[PDB]
Enzyme design. Structure first.
Site, PDB file in Angstrom:
ATOM      1  N   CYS A 200       0.827  -1.203   0.000  1.00  0.00           N
ATOM      2  CA  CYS A 200       0.000   0.000   0.000  1.00  0.00           C
ATOM      3  C   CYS A 200       0.877   1.276   0.000  1.00  0.00           C
ATOM      4  CB  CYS A 200      -0.875  -0.044   1.256  1.00  0.00           C
ATOM      5  SG  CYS A 200      -1.891   1.468   1.375  1.00  0.00           S
TER       6      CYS A 200
ATOM      7  N   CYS B  57       1.256   3.165   3.539  1.00  0.00           N
ATOM      8  CA  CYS B  57       1.584   2.434   4.793  1.00  0.00           C
ATOM      9  C   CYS B  57       2.517   1.228   4.603  1.00  0.00           C
ATOM     10  CB  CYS B  57       0.286   2.093   5.563  1.00  0.00           C
ATOM     11  SG  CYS B  57      -0.833   0.955   4.678  1.00  0.00           S
TER      12      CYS B  57
ATOM     13  N   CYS C 263     -10.555  -6.050 -11.033  1.00  0.00           N
ATOM     14  CA  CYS C 263     -10.702  -4.595 -10.756  1.00  0.00           C
ATOM     15  C   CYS C 263      -9.389  -4.025 -10.190  1.00  0.00           C
ATOM     16  CB  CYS C 263     -11.805  -4.210  -9.757  1.00  0.00           C
ATOM     17  SG  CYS C 263     -13.516  -4.697 -10.249  1.00  0.00           S
TER      18      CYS C 263
ATOM     19  N   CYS D 130      -7.170  -0.176   1.122  1.00  0.00           N
ATOM     20  CA  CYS D 130      -6.131  -0.671   2.024  1.00  0.00           C
ATOM     21  C   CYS D 130      -6.716  -1.310   3.296  1.00  0.00           C
ATOM     22  CB  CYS D 130      -5.129   0.429   2.348  1.00  0.00           C
ATOM     23  SG  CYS D 130      -3.740  -0.407   3.175  1.00  0.00           S
TER      24      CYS D 130
ATOM     25  N   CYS E 224      -5.156   3.291   7.811  1.00  0.00           N
ATOM     26  CA  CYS E 224      -4.914   3.687   6.444  1.00  0.00           C
ATOM     27  C   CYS E 224      -6.175   4.036   5.652  1.00  0.00           C
ATOM     28  CB  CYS E 224      -4.071   2.599   5.761  1.00  0.00           C
ATOM     29  SG  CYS E 224      -3.234   3.278   4.299  1.00  0.00           S
TER      30      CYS E 224
ATOM     31  N   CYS F 284      -1.590   2.114 -11.098  1.00  0.00           N
ATOM     32  CA  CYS F 284      -0.972   3.456 -10.993  1.00  0.00           C
ATOM     33  C   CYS F 284      -0.238   3.738  -9.664  1.00  0.00           C
ATOM     34  CB  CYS F 284      -2.004   4.594 -11.191  1.00  0.00           C
ATOM     35  SG  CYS F 284      -2.922   4.639 -12.769  1.00  0.00           S
TER      36      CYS F 284
ATOM     37  N   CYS G 111      -8.712   6.766 -13.631  1.00  0.00           N
ATOM     38  CA  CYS G 111      -8.517   5.325 -13.469  1.00  0.00           C
ATOM     39  C   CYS G 111      -9.772   4.486 -13.744  1.00  0.00           C
ATOM     40  CB  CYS G 111      -8.000   5.012 -12.057  1.00  0.00           C
ATOM     41  SG  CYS G 111      -6.290   5.579 -11.845  1.00  0.00           S
TER      42      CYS G 111
ATOM     43  N   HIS H 131      -8.766   2.175 -17.067  1.00  0.00           N
ATOM     44  CA  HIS H 131      -8.510   0.786 -16.621  1.00  0.00           C
ATOM     45  C   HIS H 131      -9.232   0.496 -15.289  1.00  0.00           C
ATOM     46  CE1 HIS H 131      -4.981   3.455 -15.867  1.00  0.00           C
ATOM     47  NE2 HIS H 131      -5.236   3.147 -14.562  1.00  0.00           N
TER      48      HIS H 131
HETATM   49 ZN   LIG Z   1      -2.696   1.408   3.463  1.00  0.00          ZN
HETATM   50 ZN   LIG Z   2      -5.103   4.207 -13.059  1.00  0.00          ZN
END
Ligand SMILES: [Zn+2]
Ligand SMILES: [Zn+2]
Lengths: 75, 73
Positions: free
Chosen positions: B27, B30, B40, B45, B50, B58, B66, B70
């Site tokens: 992530c 964190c 997907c 997170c 978080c 990305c 996004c 995608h």
């Molecule tokens: Zn996180």
């Molecule tokens: Zn993206």
């Protein structure tokens, strides 16, 4: 026996289980107190994954053992 | 000239930490690996400290750019 379930959060939970407990019952016992769905529970024990159709004895899981709980996303 | 500390509560947590860091992306906010199912790119997170939503490709936050470019792979 008491085991420890260490989540990817840092919250480690206590859980009482038998050597004969199925991994499915271990996840249901996590859902009861944590609210976490069993289908979102990826249990990892030292790199190996725990399959729901196995038991704690099938992985040689004893008392005081620490399991990894990975939480599966739906995307 | 000194007695070393002894413990057994190791290696199982270590090998689990290594296996997760190679099988799941960390992530951005964190450095904690977050699981991904299906295809997907919408990642949430799993660390409570978080809540950060991110694009699996990305490595940045979840956004409409996004979703069009995608949403899934
Ligand atoms: Zn996180
Ligand atoms: Zn993206």
């Amino acid at each position: 026996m008491q085991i420890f379930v260490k989540t990817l959060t840092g919250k480690t939970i206590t859980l009482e289980v038998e050597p004969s407990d199925t991994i499915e019952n271990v996840k249901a016992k996590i859902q009861d107190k944590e609210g976490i769905p069993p289908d979102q529970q990826r249990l990892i024990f030292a790199g190996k994954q725990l399959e729901d159709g196995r038991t704690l004895s099938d992985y040689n899981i004893q008392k005081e053992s620490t399991l990894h709980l990975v939480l599966r996303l739906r995307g | 000239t000194v007695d070393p500390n002894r413990a057994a509560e190791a290696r199982w947590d270590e090998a689990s930490n290594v296996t997760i860091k190679v099988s799941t992306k960390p992530c951005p906010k964190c450095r904690t690996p977050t699981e991904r199912d299906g295809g997907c790119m919408h990642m949430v997170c799993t660390r409570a400290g978080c809540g950060f939503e991110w694009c699996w490709v990305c490595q940045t936050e979840w956004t409409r750019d996004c979703m069009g470019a995608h949403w899934f792979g």
